[PDB]
């Protein structure tokens, strides 16, 4: 992904979307499961894997004590999630990311699936005053070139994407 | 409908400003409300103006101009 | 302490006076603006009542007497030599607190300021003293703002003393504010004060900052560097020409700038030295450049008029021949083939020289460097060589900006750091010692 | 190569490495390092042609760097280059370039020009630094030529003590070395001077005696080199304002000099003028015969005869052989160049000797006949320093250079005019661009109060003072200050007020004072007036129409200073009203369009500074009645396009203005209502 | 008592005479180089009639001995310019004045 990331950014890929959806459940299960924490800790210490050695070998060609054996911050799963995060960010836009943001804050105040979904469904309707620049000149300047479009996404798939990117971001900011 | 008139435009604008923000300048508040009262009291404008209105013939124009200059 | 009775019998309450002055300043402190309107009005009413009571009891004269008795001494050390070290350590602070208390007593009180109008003359007499200038200025500002009688009392001598305070103490905007208060108070102008301040402050043009519109001036030079050293291989005598195709004498209200001559670098660095890089200055505006403008020889931002047959400012169809002789340092000019009865000489020769033209907007000029870079209109003087012969074999002759930054888009502008020294320009071969 | 890029605090020093202190956070790709208060390893090294994207989040207090789009990573897994910094005064883009290094900074005014913004930063909600701007961001770069500035009270090495003059002594300015005898002490030479110059006579004419002391134009000062300081490391004399030569190795044989030789038509050199910026002597050679070097502090006395432009020196009660002859009108600053070899280096002594006036007499015109030596607070010690910035101009001259042909040479052509307003400091004999007062604060405050004083002295119809002020602030200056977009807000407001007060205030006040009185002559023009323009009872545009009521006559005088008629000291000075009106209309249209989009860079720095002076000038012209017909239609459409339309654009009324702008708009609407009332009165008279 | 340097030569034959109105552009400068007056700043040619004491006398002789179309620098001593009184607010006492006068037209 680190090698071919620019190409998917230039040309959106349903396979990349599927991979992001895939690692979303991996990350949420990683956050939810508790015994899995000490279990991975034990597995790593039994393997004596440097973990960061893979990234060091990657950045070795480009020349790019307390935590020598292992570290919380450099987990492989969160590293993969943050490397695939630009795909999610390019799929999404701020125009639904504002309600995705108060979706994260609802998750922080412990709103579960049902109320999150219905609150999003209710508050999609909040339109602005008929100038509001960031949203309209972004989307209009982008799509007034008529031929290329992504509008073929369904509202239910949009809701599911809102939910999963929101939970990924919420877990990431928690940890 | 739209204001279409200076008086209506001013009457709308003063009220819109006053109800849009709490004006911190007493001078601004006084000017706004003076203007609004002028808009709603167009008769009083003529009541004030007419006593200070005077007409003259064409032969006294230059002398009146000189007197006004002095 | 005065009257030569200096002893331990003195009864100076230095600490008590300091504490009481601080307490009184706090007592007369004006209300804060962050307070609610009604509380602010109540505090203002209480402050005005306190000021009126103090004025009626005659506290202003007591403060003035204390200030005078403290001012009979000239310095903190002079005071300490009579009163003691402890009193000297606080003489300045007590004077400052007394002035602050006076200002707080009379601030915002028209009656108090009108009564102080009588003593206003005595206040200004000590404006020059450094230990009391700020306090006296604050008191004067308050009195002049509040009382027209103060303006009526103020005369020419006081205004001239204030302007002398500007002259001696530097640029202080509070003095300008005091002068503004002298000019206008309560919407009523004082013509006498306005005329006095104008006639005594403006014509000097030595205190207030002066403003003027200046034409932007740019410079052009060939990529040629001429230098003389010991054991160098460089020729010493050089010649070039500049001929003017068009010149508008006044594109704007300011005369068009057009100077031609030579300029030197600051010790082998390619960057011209001794002058700014943006605008306003041209050839001969520093001690690193030597210019001719048709009537004057320019150097060090100083112009000397020079005689020539039918002398005139540079105009259309004028050919200027510039000669640089580094053997015996000299720079000479010839206008339209006629010699110019003036010459630069005995200048610094540690550095690299180059032809240069400085100009404002409204010119068309042409460099003639000899050979295939501009045929000379006149035969160069014997010994002198054309400037195109100084091109290094690898490089190509080119006319470019003398400075690094020109008109260009900001995102495409090249920001340049310091440049390497052109030590290779002077070829001095040093063989290995044998 | 050796380049750094990042974010700097406003107080960052121009002569210190980026990140070598607390004032800047930088990335150095020469060694793949991060820089703030030290050095740590971060990221990789760029090659030639790379693009480094600098990213700041002042909400989360984070900093990031990207190389060709890819985010640079720390030695650990952290993407953040810096994590915990206070906001302070904010951050500005900054870069540092070493020897022979070339870089380009792109603030993203045109987002399409950014190379890797879309790859990283666009999706993370990062805004380009100049996205919401109308004009190019001004650039400030470290100055090359050192300038003389007053020694700071917090200087690391130099300390200046002011010693008052007693009965038995003279005023003294003592220079001491703070850090001597401790390491990192500056062994380099320092160049000190006095803040005020002695100016020679304009034309040269080819106890003590009081009459001679009053008639003389000779001034004196001295320098005491203390024991323990090597006299061979101290130079004493005078310098001009042109002196900028900061050299570690200084000697009298390498000062800038020239000789202008002027002769007759055929040889016959009739004059030779030797010009230089440094007229000084070395104390070591000044000693000359055998002394103990320490019996008393060396006292080198400098004597300047301004009436003849002659500079002489005294070693110890003994005239030195070295002397100088300066050109007329030269301004000479007392100067000492010293390489400190002791905690106590030297001291200026502003005394006097027999038959010579002190330095204060020539420095201050108020003390021109005061033999008593003085050291007023204006006179202070300045030192040559490199801690200064230069403002890169927003526009350069367009010069076209091209090789026409082999025969014709190289053509250089420049035709488009360009000007800047120059602020001249009189005592320092230097000039700056007035746009540098955006960063120079004390000068900005003093000049704003100077403009206020200019307004005050001519306030309320002082036509003589207004005419005099026209000599100091001419109308090209006024127009340039009105139109310039980079002017500081305070100066812009001051110059607008100055223009109004000098040229427009008198007649505007006269019309406002006659405003509420309607004297309508009974003429055919008066009789032709009707309440409504046509059969349809539709109000006409206020102000537009035929008005016959008597008005004060508008008259102006030419501010010439070569005439002696004096009859022009009535009436305000004349100003180009057509040009002023056109510029006002154009500037107001531009201001409306620019403030509609709520830019980050309004003219003057704030919306108040952008609109209040412009609207004040517009209202003053409207009161004067200069506007007519089409200009009135344009200004009314600017105020309110919908109501005043003649049979998404929003006028000033629907613009979300600040309170002062609202007050001025209230004044404008008041004037429009007054115009309507006047029209009604005239129509009533016509019917009557 | 005034004296003149040429800057741009004129026609050399046509000179101001008595009863004629000179139309000129000038730029008034103090001896230190500080500008105090300029007709080019006001974009209005200055018109004055010979021998009517309309302007300062040094400027008068300078313009009189200039020619048509000529540009010249005029140096004027205080005694012919303003004397010891000076011009209040503009010209300091005993100030020598330098002008850059171009004689545009003669009416």
Swiss-Prot record, chain B:
Domain of life of the native organism: Eukaryota
N-terminal signal peptide: none
Tissue distribution of the protein: Detected in heart muscle (at protein level). Heart muscle, brain (cerebellum and hippocampus) and placenta.
Subcellular location field: Sarcoplasmic reticulum membrane
Induction (free text): By TGFB1.
Assembly and interaction partners: Homotetramer. Can also form heterotetramers with RYR1 and RYR3. Interacts with FKBP1A and FKBP1B; these interactions may stabilize the channel in its closed state and prevent Ca(2+) leaks. Interacts with CALM and S100A1; these interactions regulate channel activity. Identified in a complex composed of RYR2, FKBP1B, PKA catalytic subunit, PRKAR2A, AKAP6, and the protein phosphatases PP2A and PP1. Interacts directly with FKBP1B, PKA, PP1 and PP2A. Interacts with SELENON. In cardiac muscles, identified in a complex, composed of FSD2, CMYA5 and RYR2.
Protein family: Belongs to the ryanodine receptor (TC 1.A.3.1) family. RYR2 subfamily.
Biological role: Cytosolic calcium-activated calcium channel that mediates the release of Ca(2+) from the sarcoplasmic reticulum into the cytosol and thereby plays a key role in triggering cardiac muscle contraction. Aberrant channel activation can lead to cardiac arrhythmia. In cardiac myocytes, calcium release is triggered by increased Ca(2+) cytosolic levels due to activation of the L-type calcium channel CACNA1C. The calcium channel activity is modulated by formation of heterotetramers with RYR3. Required for cellular calcium ion homeostasis. Required for embryonic heart development.
Domain comment, as recorded: The calcium release channel activity resides in the C-terminal region while the remaining part of the protein resides in the cytoplasm.
Name the UniProt record assigns to this protein: Ryanodine receptor 2
Residues included from the entire protein: 2053 to 2122 of 4967
Curated annotation (Swiss-Prot), chain C:
Effect of residue 31 to A: In CPVT1; uncertain significance
Every B30.2/SPRY domain range: 164-374
Cellular location(s): Sarcoplasmic reticulum membrane
Organs and tissues of expression: Detected in heart muscle (at protein level). Heart muscle, brain (cerebellum and hippocampus) and placenta.
Record's note on what induces expression: By TGFB1.
Highest taxon above the source species: Eukaryota
Free-text description of this protein's post-translational modifications in UniProt: Channel activity is modulated by phosphorylation. Phosphorylation is increased in failing heart, leading to calcium leaks and increased cytoplasmic Ca(2+) levels.
Family of this protein: Belongs to the ryanodine receptor (TC 1.A.3.1) family. RYR2 subfamily.
Domain remarks in the Swiss-Prot or TrEMBL record: The calcium release channel activity resides in the C-terminal region while the remaining part of the protein resides in the cytoplasm.
Disease listed for this protein: Ventricular tachycardia, catecholaminergic polymorphic, 1, with or without atrial dysfunction and/or dilated cardiomyopathy: An arrhythmogenic disorder characterized by stress-induced, bidirectional ventricular tachycardia that may degenerate into cardiac arrest and cause sudden death. Patients present with recurrent syncope, seizures, or sudden death after physical activity or emotional stress. CPVT1 inheritance is autosomal dominant.
Subunit structure: Homotetramer. Can also form heterotetramers with RYR1 and RYR3. Interacts with FKBP1A and FKBP1B; these interactions may stabilize the channel in its closed state and prevent Ca(2+) leaks. Interacts with CALM and S100A1; these interactions regulate channel activity. Identified in a complex composed of RYR2, FKBP1B, PKA catalytic subunit, PRKAR2A, AKAP6, and the protein phosphatases PP2A and PP1. Interacts directly with FKBP1B, PKA, PP1 and PP2A. Interacts with SELENON. In cardiac muscles, identified in a complex, composed of FSD2, CMYA5 and RYR2.
This protein's name: Ryanodine receptor 2
Native source organism of the sequence: Homo sapiens (Human)
Gene that encodes the chain: RYR2
Swiss-Prot record, chain E:
Protein name, per record: Peptidyl-prolyl cis-trans isomerase FKBP1B
Entry GO CC: calcium channel complex; cytoplasm; membrane; sarcoplasmic reticulum membrane; Z disc
Gene name of the encoded protein: FKBP1B
EC number: 5.2.1.8
Record organism: Homo sapiens
Protein family (similarity comment): Belongs to the FKBP-type PPIase family. FKBP1 subfamily.
Function as written in the Swiss-Prot or TrEMBL entry: Has the potential to contribute to the immunosuppressive and toxic effects of FK506 and rapamycin. PPIases accelerate the folding of proteins. It catalyzes the cis-trans isomerization of proline imidic peptide bonds in oligopeptides.
Coiled coil: none
Tissue expression from the record: Detected in heart muscle (at protein level). Isoform 1 and isoform 2 are ubiquitous with highest levels in brain and thymus.
Gene Ontology BP terms: 'de novo' protein folding; calcium-mediated signaling; insulin secretion involved in cellular response to glucose stimulus; negative regulation of calcium-mediated signaling; negative regulation of heart rate; negative regulation of insulin secretion involved in cellular response to glucose stimulus; negative regulation of release of sequestered calcium ion into cytosol; neuronal action potential propagation
